[PDB]
C-alpha cells in the first residue's frame, strides 16, 4: 500500500483511454501488416518493432495494475485475470515472432501458425472484453 497510492491514481488521467486507443492502433497496425504484400525484411522488422513495442507497453500497464492494486484484489476478480492472461499470451507470441525466433525450436512447440492466428484474434477479443 506504500506505493499503491501513487500508482493507482496515475493509472487514471488520461491512461484510461490512451491505453484503449493504443489497442485500436495495434489492430490497425496488424491489418496494415497483413495487407502489404512482399514487404522486405527491413520493412518487416519495422512493423514487427511497432507490434512488440505496443505489446511491451501493454505488458507494463499490467505490472502496474498489479503492483498498484496488489496481487490479491485484482486476482480475486478472475474476469480481469482473463484480460491479463490474454495480454501475457500475446506478448509471448509476439516476442517470439518479432525477436526471439530463431530460438523457438527450443520451445519444442508445434502449431506455430495457429498460435499466431490465435494471438491476433486475442487482440480483437480484448476490445470485445471492453463493454
Amino acid at each position, epitope marked *: 500500500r506504500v506505493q499503491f497510492r501513487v500508482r493507482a491514481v496515475i493509472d487514471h488521467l488520461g491512461m484510461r483511454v490512451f491505453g484503449v486507443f493504443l489497442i485500436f492502433l495495434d489492430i490497425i497496425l496488424m491489418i496494415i501488416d497483413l495487407s502489404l504484400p512482399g514487404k522486405s525484411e527491413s520493412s518487416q522488422s519495422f512493423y514487427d518493432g511497432m507490434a512488440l513495442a505496443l505489446s511491451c507497453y501493454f505488458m507494463l500497464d499490467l505490472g502496474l495494475r498489479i503492483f498498484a492494486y496488489g496481487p490479491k484484489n485484482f486476482f480475486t476478480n478472475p474476469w480481469e485475470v482473463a484480460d491479463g492472461l490474454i495480454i501475457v499470451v500475446t506478448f509471448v507470441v509476439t516476442i517470439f515472432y518479432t525477436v526471439l*525466433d*530463431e530460438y*523457438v*525450436q*527450443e*520451445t*519444442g*512447440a*508445434d*502449431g*506455430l*501458425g*495457429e*498460435l499466431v492466428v490465435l494471438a491476433r484474434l486475442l487482440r480483437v477479443v480484448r476490445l470485445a472484453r471492453i463493454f
Partner: antibody
Amino acid sequence: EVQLVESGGGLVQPGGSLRLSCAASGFNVSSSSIHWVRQAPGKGLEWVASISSYYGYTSYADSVKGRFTISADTSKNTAYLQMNSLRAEDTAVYYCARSYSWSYAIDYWGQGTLVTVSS
Amino acid sequence: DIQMTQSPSSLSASVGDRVTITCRASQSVSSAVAWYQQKPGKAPKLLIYSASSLYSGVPSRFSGSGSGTDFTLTISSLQPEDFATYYCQQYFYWPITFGQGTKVEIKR
C-alpha cells in the same frame, strides 16, 4: 489406434478421371487436417492438397489446381480426392496423411495407392 | 515458393557412425521443419518435428537441429535398419515443400 486406408487407385486413360478415398480411424477428420501427397515412381514427395474441415479450409498445389478437389465426408470419417483430366505426369503413389491441424507436422501416412495414367 | 535444398543426395556410412544430413530453407520458416524416413515401397514415418522435437517412440539416435535457415538431421549411431531415404519438409509457408531426399546406405 490411428489408421488411414486409401483406395480408388489404378489405371486410367489420359483425359480421364479417378476418385481416391481415405478411410480414417482413431481421430476425426472434422477437427484434423488431411493431406494427399504423391510420389512419382522413382522420385521424391510432392505435396498435392489439404483439407482442414474445421476452418472450411482447403488448399492445392499448382500442378493440380483446377483438376483435383479434396473433400471430407465428416460422418463417414473419410476424405476423398477427386482427380480429373489426368495426365501422365500424375502417375504416382498417392498417400493420404494426417496432422493434428494445419500448422502442425504431418504425423502419420497411409501405405498409399497407385495411380497409373496411360493409354 | 520455398525450396528445401537438401544434401548430400546420398551417403554411405558404417554401423556406429554418426551421419549428418542438411537441409537449407530458401527463407526463414521458423521451426516448422519436419524429418521423415521412408523405407523402400513404404509410407514415410515421421522422426522429428519443430526442427528438433523427437516424435514419440522414435529411437533417440535421431535428432534435429535448427540454425537460422539451416536444418540438420543427425543420426548418431547408425544402425543397419536405418537404410532409408530421409526427407526434410517445411510446413510453415504454403505450399508444403520437401527436399529432394538423402538416400542413406549402410557400409558393411
